[PDB]
Amino acid sequence: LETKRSEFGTSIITPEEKLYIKNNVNTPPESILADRDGWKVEISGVKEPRTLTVAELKTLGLVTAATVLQCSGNGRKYFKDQLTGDQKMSGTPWTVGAAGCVIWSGVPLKAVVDALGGPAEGARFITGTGGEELPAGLDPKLLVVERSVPISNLDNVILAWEMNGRPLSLAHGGPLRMVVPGYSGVNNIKYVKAVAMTEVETDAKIQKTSYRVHALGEKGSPDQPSVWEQPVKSWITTPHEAAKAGQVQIAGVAFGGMNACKSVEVSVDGGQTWQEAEFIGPDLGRFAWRVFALSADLARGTYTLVSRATDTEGNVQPEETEMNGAGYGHNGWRAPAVKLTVA
Amino acid sequence: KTLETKRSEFGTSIITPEEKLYIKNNVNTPPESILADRDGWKVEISGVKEPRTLTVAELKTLGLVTAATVLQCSGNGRKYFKDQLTGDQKMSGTPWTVGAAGCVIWSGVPLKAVVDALGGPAEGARFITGTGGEELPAGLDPKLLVVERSVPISNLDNVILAWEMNGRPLSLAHGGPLRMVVPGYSGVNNIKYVKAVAMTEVETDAKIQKTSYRVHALGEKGSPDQPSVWEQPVKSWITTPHEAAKAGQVQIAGVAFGGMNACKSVEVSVDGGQTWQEAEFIGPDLGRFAWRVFALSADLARGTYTLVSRATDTEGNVQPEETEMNGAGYGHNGWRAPAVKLTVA
Numbered sequence: 001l002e003t004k005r006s007e008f009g010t011s012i013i014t015p016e017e018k019l020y021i022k023n024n025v026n027t028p029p030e031s032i033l034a035d036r037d038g039w040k041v042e043i044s045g046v047k048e049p050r051t052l053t054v055a056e057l058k059t060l061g062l063v064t065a066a067t068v069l070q071c072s073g074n075g076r077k078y079f080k081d082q083l084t085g086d087q088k089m090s091g092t093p094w095t096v097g098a099a100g101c102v103i104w105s106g107v108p109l110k111a112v113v114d115a116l117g118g119p120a121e122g123a124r125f126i127t128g129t130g131g132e133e134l135p136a137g138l139d140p141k142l143l144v145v146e147r148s149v150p151i152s153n154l155d156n157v158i159l160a161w162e163m164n165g166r167p168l169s170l171a172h173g174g175p176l177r178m179v180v181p182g183y184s185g186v187n188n189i190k191y192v193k194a195v196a197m198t199e200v201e202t203d204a205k206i207q208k209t210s211y212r213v214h215a216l217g218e219k220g221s222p223d224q225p226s227v228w229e230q231p232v233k234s235w236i237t238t239p240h241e242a243a244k245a246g247q248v249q250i251a252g253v254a255f256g257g258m259n260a261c262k263s264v265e266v267s268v269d270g271g272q273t274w275q276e277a278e279f280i281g282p283d284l285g286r287f288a289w290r291v292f293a294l295s296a297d298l299a300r301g302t303y304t305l306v307s308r309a310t311d312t313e314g315n316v317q318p319e320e321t322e323m324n325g326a327g328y329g330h331n332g333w334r335a336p337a338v339k340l341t342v343a
Numbered sequence: 344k345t346l347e348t349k350r351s352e353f354g355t356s357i358i359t360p361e362e363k364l365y366i367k368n369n370v371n372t373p374p375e376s377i378l379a380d381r382d383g384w385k386v387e388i389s390g391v392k393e394p395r396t397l398t399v400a401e402l403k404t405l406g407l408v409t410a411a412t413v414l415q416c417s418g419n420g421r422k423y424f425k426d427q428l429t430g431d432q433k434m435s436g437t438p439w440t441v442g443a444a445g446c447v448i449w450s451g452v453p454l455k456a457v458v459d460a461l462g463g464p465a466e467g468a469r470f471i472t473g474t475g476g477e478e479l480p481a482g483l484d485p486k487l488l489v490v491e492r493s494v495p496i497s498n499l500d501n502v503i504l505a506w507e508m509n510g511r512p513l514s515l516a517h518g519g520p521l522r523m524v525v526p527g528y529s530g531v532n533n534i535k536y537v538k539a540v541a542m543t544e545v546e547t548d549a550k551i552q553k554t555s556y557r558v559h560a561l562g563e564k565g566s567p568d569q570p571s572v573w574e575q576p577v578k579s580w581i582t583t584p585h586e587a588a589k590a591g592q593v594q595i596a597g598v599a600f601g602g603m604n605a606c607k608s609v610e611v612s613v614d615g616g617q618t619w620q621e622a623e624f625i626g627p628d629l630g631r632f633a634w635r636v637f638a639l640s641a642d643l644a645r646g647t648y649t650l651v652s653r654a655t656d657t658e659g660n661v662q663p664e665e666t667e668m669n670g671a672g673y674g675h676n677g678w679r680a681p682a683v684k685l686t687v688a
């Protein structure tokens with residue numbers, strides 16, 4: 001399920017009912033939400049390992065933060081567009097609609113691990129396991145949705161039970177989700193049933209070989225970069241198609257992943273000339289996105305609207321993103337251009 | 344048809360979900376068909392150098408602004424005034440506790456941009472006067488029923504003509520297709536389905552401005568020499584937990600705002616205001632007109648606690664224990680009355 005450009009709005013926050021849905025496996029039954037507070041999470045790799053219920057988690061702390069939830073596959077269509085000859089690429093051909101900015105609320109993982117005496121000596125990763133039932137007999141490593149991120153993320157990770165002021169839906173990973181701000185969608189583990197502080201990455205297929213950045217025709221392997229930190233990115237959201245001659249408000253969303261978006265330039269002529277856009281609305285912090293807008297006075301014609309964001313570390317979107325075989329992490333400014341017909 | 348939000352339904356994400364947001368109308372709602380063609384909705388702009396009627400489509404060309412505000416009825420907390428009546432004293436109106444309030448993100452065009460595009464306000468303009476889009480009964484005195492409100496023109500730079508709330512087109516319940524939003528001002532001033540915005544030399548003399556929504560003593564009539572319900576005062580309340588908890592660690596949370604000013608700090612007491620501790624803010628700061636979530640991490644023995652919060656704004660205005668009585672029961676902001684009784688077992 002992919003969001004259309006008109007549906008992002010300009011309120012920063014993406015409506016929960018329009019937020020994209022992506023699952024690697026079939027979803028659990030909705031009955032896991034019957035008793036949200038009774039959902040159990042096994043916490044290990046800490047000094048005092050224990051299973052805690054969501055009711056217990058709710059006693060330990062409270063944190064609220066906005067992040068950009070974006071599939072590593074967002075923009076895959078734009079990689080497929082660059083294929084030539086016999087070159088092939090499988091996977092969902094997302095354009096820009098596998099992304100939203102949402103507000104999570106829950107308990108800091110740091111508060112949970114501290115209540116259990118802190119991480120075990122030598123821990124280097126946070127490893128979260130999805131709560132889906134695995135089919136009996138088969139090697140669960142082949143199907144389990146289990147991801148590892150560096151333990152440097154500990155102070156930012158949230159075990160969230162709420163999003164945009166509502167209890168977390170099944171579609172978005174209720175009753176509890178491991179949120180890793182600034183990291184690609186796959187790392188944000190839905191219906192999280194275990195969190196382990198580990199010395200090594202999980203060897204689950206979804207970590208070891210899937211979700212790796214490699215050349216076309218190469219297999220994924222664990223020496224290659226995983227889809228972890230999200231790169232600087234933006235796109236135009238409005239007007240998504242049309243306007244009338246004269247003043248037009250051009251707007252979109254921009255983010256720096258782990259870093260704040262510092263500035264955004266907008267072009268109406270496919271990147272031949274650029275102008276600085278203004279940020280619109282409140283700043284929800286470095287892991288969220290900003291709305292930006294440029295006022296332009298346009299004659300009747302067909303414009304090519306593009307946006308180019310820079311983060312606080314000086315990372316800037318390229319015109320086109322280097323190819324990788326599975327089509328992860330697109331952040332180019334040319335491919336997501338909006339054709340604006342001005343009447 | 345009113346809808347009051349339950350304490351359990353505010354959440355701790357700052358933003359109040361649209362489907363939980365309270366509903367209050369002074370008259371019947373217009374039909375759903377006014378949303379069929381949102382972009383064709385017309386707004387008459389007057390009291391400017393070049394007056395004209397603009398459609399929502401035209402308004403959308405002139406600017407873009409996004410801002411969070413606390414939308415709260417002047418009547419929120421009226422129950423707490425009714426609880427203080429003695430003897431023969433009476434007070435009509437909806438007995439809201441704390442649920443006639445939410446924090447929402449609006450998006451639309453700044454009224455300043457609209458006014459600037461039409462050559463600025465006419466010399467001598469003193470008020471911004473918005474007229475609701477409801478149909479009025481034919482041949483009856485429209486002043487008696489029209490939802491028309493005037494606020495000082497000092498609000499010009501803050502006012503938004505909003506077509507969107509919380510990332511979606513504004514619903515009928517919350518004043519689509521276009522709403523005049525007056526940040527920091529009481530709910531009544533945030534005119535739904537706004538069909539006219541006038542920069543006027545005087546307040547409207549519509550009943551709902553002249554004599555309703557005035558602050559007066561019990562047994563007095565409303566009159567235009569009295570303060571109108573305009574700026575909303577510093578306020579907070581506890582939202583969670585709402586009834587029971589287990590002994591041990593308890594996260595006590597709520598919402599706090601300063602109205603025209605940001606909330607700077609919040610104190611929380613678990614013993615009915617005898618002892619206070621400073622709470623922490625939770626989540627991002629959505630600006631001076633929004634509310635903050637706050638929380639206190641408490642460690643509680645078995646017993647019956649009385650949870651209260653006391654907010655201070657950036658200018659040193661602090662909530663009183665009790666709010667001075669007024670006859671229509673507007674603007675309650677006391678910390679004692681909205682206490683949560685928490686049974687810890």
Ligand code: MSS
Nearest residue numbers: 020021022023024071072130145185186190
């Ligand atoms: N448990 C789990 N979790 C999980 C999953 C699954 O399947 N399971 N998926 C992923 C992905 S992959 Mo690609 O990188 S994007 C993504 C995300 C999505 O989310 P939403 O649906 O809520 O939107 O999630 C995440 N998480």
Ligand code: MSS
Nearest residue numbers: 366367368369416417475490517530531535
């Ligand atoms: N047009 C119009 N608007 C309007 C109206 C009516 O009736 N009409 N109401 C008021 C009031 S009053 Mo007392 O101060 S509160 C209030 C508000 C509400 O909102 P929601 O329903 O959305 O919540 O609105 C406002 N606006």
